[PDB]
Amino acid sequence: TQERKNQLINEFKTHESDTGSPEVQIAILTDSINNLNEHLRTHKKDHHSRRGLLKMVGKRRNLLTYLRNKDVTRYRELINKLGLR
Amino acid sequence: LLEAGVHFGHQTRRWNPKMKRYIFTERNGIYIIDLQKTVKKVEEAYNFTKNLAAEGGKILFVGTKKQAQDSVKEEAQRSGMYYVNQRWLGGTLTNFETIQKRIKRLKDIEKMQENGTFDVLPKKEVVQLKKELERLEKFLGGIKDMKDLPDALFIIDPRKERIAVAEARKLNIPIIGIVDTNCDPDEIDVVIPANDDAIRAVKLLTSKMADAILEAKQ
Amino acid sequence: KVCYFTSNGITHIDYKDVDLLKKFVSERGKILPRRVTGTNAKYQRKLTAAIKRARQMALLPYVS
Amino acid sequence: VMTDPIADMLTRIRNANMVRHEKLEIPASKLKREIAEILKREGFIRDVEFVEDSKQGIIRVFLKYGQNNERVITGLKRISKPGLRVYAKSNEVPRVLNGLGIAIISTSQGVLTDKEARAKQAGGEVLAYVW
Amino acid sequence: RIDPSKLELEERLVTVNRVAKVVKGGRRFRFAALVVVGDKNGHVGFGTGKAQEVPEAIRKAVEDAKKNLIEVPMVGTTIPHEIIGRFGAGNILLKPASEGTGVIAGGPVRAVLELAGVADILSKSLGSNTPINMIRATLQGLSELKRAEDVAKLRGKSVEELLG
Amino acid sequence: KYEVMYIIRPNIDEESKKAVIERFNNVLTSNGAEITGTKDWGKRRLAYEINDFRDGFYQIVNVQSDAAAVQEFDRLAKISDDIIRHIVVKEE
RNA sequence: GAACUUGAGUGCAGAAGAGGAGAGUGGAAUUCCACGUGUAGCGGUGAAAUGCGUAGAGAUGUGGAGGAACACCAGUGGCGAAGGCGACUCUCUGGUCUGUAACUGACGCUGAGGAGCGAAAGCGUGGGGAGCGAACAGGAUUAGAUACCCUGGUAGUCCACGCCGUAAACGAUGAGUGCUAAGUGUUAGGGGGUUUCCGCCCCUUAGUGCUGCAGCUAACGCAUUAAGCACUCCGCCUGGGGAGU
């Protein structure tokens, strides 16, 4: 906590004041999904966290479609950075 | 303009949003009436009640609280009109003919105990006359010599007496009245905001309205 | 009634306060309800959590 | 969400009628401004005023109760809902309560009324009955 | 306002129901009549009456009917505008008609609109067929009607700025 | 942050009690779990009997760790017979 | 195509919660076991009887084993999408609410089909069995008693994984949003007017109860936690039975 999110902000800043700006937000979502999925490999009987993971995947996919419809090259460079394919 | 009065006016938490145009709010929790919206309204009530007692419908004065008893009674017996000092019998106005029957019965029996024959049995005068005179006098009051439908109606509390106000509003009698902060100003035709349980405020207001009708008969 | 913890301004009840918890615990050993001790909802929750933890360290009794 | 704001302003006027409120704030798009200008010029309203602000702006309405307690507007209705839009030709423009009510109809030359669109002989969206 | 009943009235009836109440002994019956009363100059009303007999029930119904009267606008001997009256799962629309059609209406609606003096009505009941709620539905639809002069005075307007 | 409060059984000599505390501190230094404060209430009367005993020694160790030698303390306190109790409370 | 920030979300800061999953620990009590006390009953019922008991029971003291639920808190209290979730602690982890102003700048909602969760009973495999307990046995009641009552007691209830995928799965009330009197408790915040406080009052959120106006309704009732007034989307109904065949 609180070095990881801040490094991901400072890594995926496109302006200085960017804490919104869907690349920061998708990147926090990706690493939280990854932590959660490793949690599910530890804990398979947890279902409410699975619901939260499904909410995260839905948020992140809709933000991806918003980036696809907004800026093509930024969307492709984000995909190539995160590897989210 | 505080002419003589003392009324900030009444209720705590049980209060009506239909008086938002009239009241203030004290930190006591008991509500204070805006007297600028009282003086103009009692002035128009004064004028309209002068007009009604100038035309010739007598006036009803109705008060059915322990505060209201001596005030409404003495004020209507000062002005000479028709009062209700005890309970309001259900249907004095809409049920008018059967109340005319019972008041004519009271008139017959109160004439009989001083002009007519007083010697019938040893106790038919007790068991009939006295027992019967008591209830009928106590409840039929100064509307005894009524002879006719009234024109208007002056009450002391609409929340205490929703039945009389209800069939008054049914019979389309215009009504003057003091209301409270929990009462409904939509129901009263002529709305006066003041205190309905401070005896000096109700004596003052019945005094003002009886003086209004007393300046009218000339 | 009146709350204790709002009066003395004290926050997290700190299980180590065995005498204060001993004031809140009843004569037999039970936790007194909120309408007896007069606390808040939040402070009654932290009180009962405190009493159960202090029971598991024998700072408070179960049965007496 | 909110799915159309014109129907929502019509119900906001209707609820202010049924409560017998005297003023209304409505979030004021341009077609709402033109609707309230029509309802001003047709005497359903006393006066209408705009508050241009930062969020989206406010339009305030002063409901007209001309006599004792008489709602000049009895009811409102929206015809073209977002999901069934309704369009009338000029030989089908509805005249409502035959003359005593009206229909706000925004054709290609201005957001018009009944008589205005009838005298210009054009049709478009049919977006309010006003009684 | 309350309509003072001093007019000439025609007082014809819709229904008399026979209407029971069960006691220890058995059924005790009454007759509940509802009667529509009004002149054909724009004043209508109706009333209910209950008695052990039929004619005293019709008496009480005619008295209570003279008590409750309504007014109706006769703009061009028709009604001014189409309206739906909606008293409680009885819904009845009323259209103005042309001048030759006559009152096209079912029984209690027809009784109301003929004893109203309104001559040319298209109408239809879109609900339940009890006489009481249909008459209540018609008078709900006839209470909300509007005169063109009064609505022109309401809109700060003139009649010809509405009617044309 | 953790408050690590445990009860030493009473029938224990003082150097052996130092050997118990040195042992479990050696256990805590398997993490890096620094000892930011110590406290011994001493022999207190327990609210209820544990095995046969009315009384026991209390030990408070304030730790700021990575949640590992706390768990090593848990497994070593479920095994060591010279302990009456233990709790670890997340100090928040 | 360009802007904006209200809708949505991120940022920072707290706050509350039986939200979930994994592991560990505790104290009553029930049962069982051994020993001391000791003797004739115990148990149970509307009445009794089967049972348990001198081979020493029931009661009682100490000790041990084992399972399951977590008294008091506890509350029209909280959390969760629903099922549901009440000891405690740690490990991981989901969501909410509040204060804004830092950011994004319409990125939102609903959602057939699909994917998942899904009480209880049930099924498969391996364990487990203290209480309870279908089935089953005896005794009673009874015309009969495949029942209610009593004494026993199998599967099951428990755990691990896999399947079923159903409930009066209920608020018999889909989700979202806006508007439309009040009073009053309460849950978690925030802010103001004196007091550092204690505390009172006021204001504002989001959630949760009751009474209640307009409005609705066939009525009962709902009423800002709608069953009002509207818009979006989905599911469902078109007489009862046959038949959820």
Side-chain angles (χ1 to χ4, degrees):
Chain A
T1 64
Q2 293 305 113
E3 62 174 355
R4 183 64 61 88
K5 285 196 287 182
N6 296 322
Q7 282 180 357
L8 287 176
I9 289 169
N10 298 318
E11 177 68 27
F12 288 96
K13 276 178 185 178
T14 55
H15 299 168
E16 182 179 3
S17 61
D18 289 339
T19 59
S21 297
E23 41 269 12
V24 182
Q25 187 170 344
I26 285 169
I28 297 168
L29 285 166
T30 60
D31 286 348
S32 189
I33 285 169
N34 289 314
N35 284 317
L36 213 170
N37 196 354
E38 292 182 355
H39 167 266
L40 294 170
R41 293 177 191 176
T42 61
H43 304 288
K44 288 179 181 178
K45 202 59 67 179
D46 196 2
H47 301 287
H48 300 271
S49 65
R50 274 171 181 160
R51 199 274 188 109
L53 185 141
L54 290 170
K55 284 187 178 182
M56 291 179 183
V57 170
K59 286 181 183 178
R60 192 184 69 189
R61 181 190 294 115
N62 294 320
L63 287 170
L64 284 172
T65 60
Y66 182 66
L67 278 179
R68 184 187 296 115
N69 292 316
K70 188 184 175 187
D71 288 324
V72 176
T73 60
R74 187 181 299 172
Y75 174 70
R76 191 177 298 116
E77 288 168 352
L78 177 144
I79 287 176
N80 289 314
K81 283 180 182 177
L82 293 167
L84 204 165
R85 189 175 292 275
Chain B
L1 180 63
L2 191 145
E3 286 178 347
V6 76
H7 50 275
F8 57 96
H10 211 67
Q11 292 281 328
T12 176
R13 66 182 183 177
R14 289 172 181 170
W15 65 273
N16 204 162
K18 299 297 176 180
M19 287 183 71
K20 192 264 188 293
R21 63 174 68 91
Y22 283 158
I23 56 96
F24 285 158
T25 297
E26 195 181 3
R27 194 178 175 88
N28 204 168
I30 190 169
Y31 284 172
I32 297 173
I33 299 167
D34 193 1
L35 49 90
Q36 295 179 357
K37 308 297 181 68
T38 299
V39 176
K40 300 187 285 186
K41 294 297 291 183
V42 70
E43 186 173 2
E44 292 187 358
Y46 191 85
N47 294 321
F48 180 64
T49 312
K50 275 189 173 177
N51 197 1
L52 293 181
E55 295 300 326
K58 304 280 107 172
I59 283 300
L60 293 174
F61 288 103
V62 176
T64 313
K65 293 188 285 181
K66 295 291 184 183
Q67 292 84 18
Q69 290 182 0
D70 296 331
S71 297
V72 169
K73 183 176 180 181
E74 289 168 352
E75 284 286 325
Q77 291 177 358
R78 196 266 306 281
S79 64
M81 298 305 107
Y82 299 149
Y83 68 92
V84 172
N85 57 1
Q86 289 293 323
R87 85 171 67 243
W88 193 83
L89 295 169
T92 60
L93 293 170
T94 61
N95 207 4
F96 182 74
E97 299 292 331
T98 187
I99 306 300
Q100 181 179 359
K101 295 178 183 180
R102 178 59 56 184
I103 200 62
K104 183 185 66 62
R105 191 264 190 277
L106 180 55
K107 188 179 289 186
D108 284 329
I109 198 64
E110 80 177 5
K111 184 61 70 70
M112 195 64 66
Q113 54 87 31
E114 55 93 9
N115 203 169
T117 62
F118 192 71
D119 49 356
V120 173
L121 268 297
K123 68 196 74 174
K124 184 65 71 176
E125 296 91 0
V126 172
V127 176
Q128 181 59 254
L129 179 149
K130 292 183 175 182
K131 188 198 286 284
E132 174 265 325
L133 276 172
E134 290 293 325
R135 187 190 299 175
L136 270 74
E137 281 291 326
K138 282 184 180 180
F139 293 118
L140 288 87
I143 63 163
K144 59 182 291 184
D145 199 359
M146 74 81 195
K147 294 191 288 184
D148 197 0
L149 285 172
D151 196 1
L153 173 53
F154 182 71
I155 64 168
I156 195 158
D157 199 0
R159 178 70 179 271
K160 183 73 174 178
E161 198 180 358
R162 291 179 295 174
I163 293 95
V165 178
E167 84 169 11
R169 179 63 177 85
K170 173 169 281 194
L171 208 139
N172 202 358
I173 288 171
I175 51 174
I176 45 176
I178 168 175
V179 299
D180 200 2
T181 66
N182 55 3
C183 301
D184 194 0
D186 197 3
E187 190 70 25
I188 310 297
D189 282 327
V190 180
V191 45
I192 294 171
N195 208 163
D196 53 357
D197 58 350
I199 50 173
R200 293 180 293 178
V202 308
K203 177 68 179 179
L204 182 66
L205 288 182
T206 54
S207 178
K208 293 291 286 185
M209 301 308 285
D211 296 339
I213 65 170
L214 192 61
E215 293 177 1
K217 290 186 178 181
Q218 299 296 324
Chain C
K1 287 183 179 181
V2 179
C3 303
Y4 188 89
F5 297 92
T6 67
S7 74
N8 293 314
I10 182 70
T11 185
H12 304 287
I13 297 178
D14 288 328
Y15 315 133
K16 59 100 174 182
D17 291 331
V18 179
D19 297 334
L20 184 142
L21 302 177
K22 198 185 268 81
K23 286 185 175 182
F24 286 101
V25 163
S26 68
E27 291 186 352
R28 294 179 184 177
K30 294 181 184 181
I31 301 168
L32 285 172
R34 187 189 174 190
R35 70 263 179 98
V36 181
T37 58
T39 60
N40 286 324
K42 178 182 173 182
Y43 288 146
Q44 189 61 253
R45 296 166 195 175
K46 290 176 172 63
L47 275 171
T48 56
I51 291 164
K52 291 170 185 177
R53 292 184 187 181
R55 281 177 186 175
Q56 295 188 357
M57 290 298 291
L59 296 175
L60 287 176
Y62 282 104
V63 179
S64 67
Chain D
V1 197
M2 188 76 188
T3 62
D4 52 338
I6 296 167
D8 287 325
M9 79 164 292
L10 291 168
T11 67
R12 193 172 288 182
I13 298 168
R14 191 188 303 116
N15 297 327
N17 273 313
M18 298 308 297
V19 176
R20 285 170 178 165
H21 269 173
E22 299 171 353
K23 305 179 295 294
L24 286 176
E25 58 182 3
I26 294 166
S29 69
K30 193 174 183 179
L31 206 161
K32 298 178 186 177
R33 293 184 181 183
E34 279 170 345
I35 283 177
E37 193 183 4
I38 284 172
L39 293 178
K40 167 65 174 65
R41 76 184 70 185
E42 295 182 2
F44 287 99
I45 302 174
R46 286 175 185 169
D47 198 357
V48 63
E49 65 191 5
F50 308 102
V51 183
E52 296 184 358
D53 286 332
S54 65
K55 191 176 291 181
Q56 206 265 117
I58 296 168
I59 187 167
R60 289 170 68 189
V61 183
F62 290 92
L63 279 79
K64 179 176 176 180
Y65 301 144
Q67 282 71 240
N68 191 4
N69 276 322
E70 296 183 1
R71 297 177 180 91
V72 177
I73 310 171
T74 61
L76 300 180
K77 185 176 170 67
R78 190 172 181 182
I79 304 157
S80 74
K81 294 177 285 293
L84 178 57
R85 300 193 184 93
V86 178
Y87 304 98
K89 294 186 179 183
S90 66
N91 292 318
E92 300 174 357
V93 171
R95 54 97 51 79
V96 193
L97 299 190
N98 309 314
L100 204 60
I102 211 147
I104 300 169
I105 290 169
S106 73
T107 73
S108 63
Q109 49 178 354
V111 175
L112 290 177
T113 79
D114 195 3
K115 300 176 186 177
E116 295 180 351
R118 185 73 70 88
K120 291 181 185 182
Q121 299 172 358
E125 279 276 336
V126 186
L127 57 90
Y129 280 157
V130 177
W131 299 294
Chain E
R1 294 180 182 178
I2 289 173
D3 297 331
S5 61
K6 285 179 93 287
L7 287 163
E8 290 183 355
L9 303 174
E10 301 190 5
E11 50 97 20
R12 74 189 188 186
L13 80 164
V14 178
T15 59
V16 180
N17 196 2
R18 53 176 289 160
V19 158
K21 188 259 189 70
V22 183
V23 191
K24 176 74 80 177
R27 303 168 189 172
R28 301 292 186 266
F29 297 98
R30 288 184 284 175
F31 290 97
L34 95 158
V35 179
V36 180
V37 173
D39 61 348
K40 295 179 176 179
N41 288 318
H43 294 81
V44 210
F46 79 104
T48 68
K50 292 173 68 177
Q52 292 179 355
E53 306 177 359
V54 176
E56 288 185 357
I58 299 171
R59 287 178 180 174
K60 293 177 182 177
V62 169
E63 285 185 354
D64 188 76
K66 287 177 181 177
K67 288 184 182 181
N68 193 357
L69 286 175
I70 206 162
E71 200 273 332
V72 56
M74 289 164 161
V75 179
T77 67
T78 64
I79 59 168
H81 61 273
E82 177 179 356
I83 194 161
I84 304 164
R86 292 180 188 269
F87 194 86
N91 304 328
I92 294 165
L93 86 142
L94 300 168
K95 286 185 175 177
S98 64
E99 286 183 353
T101 71
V103 184
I104 301 168
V109 182
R110 189 168 174 85
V112 166
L113 293 173
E114 286 180 358
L115 286 169
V118 193
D120 296 324
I121 306 101
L122 296 169
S123 75
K124 182 78 180 171
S125 72
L126 304 170
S128 68
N129 286 316
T130 70
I132 302 168
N133 289 319
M134 284 197 288
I135 291 168
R136 288 283 180 93
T138 55
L139 294 178
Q140 180 69 38
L142 296 179
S143 75
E144 296 176 353
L145 283 173
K146 297 170 189 181
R147 288 179 185 269
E149 304 178 354
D150 201 359
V151 170
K153 188 253 181 61
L154 281 173
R155 292 191 190 181
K157 204 180 280 189
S158 182
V159 181
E160 290 83 4
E161 194 175 0
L162 287 177
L163 197 64
Chain F
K1 288 181 181 177
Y2 298 106
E3 181 172 357
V4 180
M5 172 173 64
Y6 60 95
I7 298 170
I8 302 174
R9 61 177 294 276
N11 292 322
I12 281 178
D13 285 332
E14 297 178 352
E15 187 184 1
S16 60
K17 183 255 193 66
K18 292 291 182 290
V20 174
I21 305 167
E22 281 177 348
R23 176 181 294 174
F24 286 100
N25 290 322
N26 282 318
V27 172
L28 292 176
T29 53
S30 66
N31 192 7
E34 60 182 3
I35 303 165
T36 65
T38 58
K39 174 62 183 292
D40 181 76
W41 288 95
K43 192 176 183 183
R44 291 176 62 89
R45 179 66 69 95
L46 307 167
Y48 54 91
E49 61 176 352
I50 305 293
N51 284 316
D52 284 323
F53 296 101
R54 299 180 184 178
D55 45 10
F57 293 106
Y58 283 82
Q59 296 290 322
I60 302 171
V61 175
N62 293 322
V63 173
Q64 192 269 334
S65 68
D66 210 6
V70 161
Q71 296 165 353
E72 291 181 353
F73 181 82
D74 284 331
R75 55 99 61 216
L76 280 166
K78 289 187 289 292
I79 287 169
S80 70
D81 297 334
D82 54 2
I83 265 180
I84 277 176
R85 285 294 184 191
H86 68 279
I87 51 99
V88 175
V89 168
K90 178 185 280 285
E91 286 178 347
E92 291 178 356

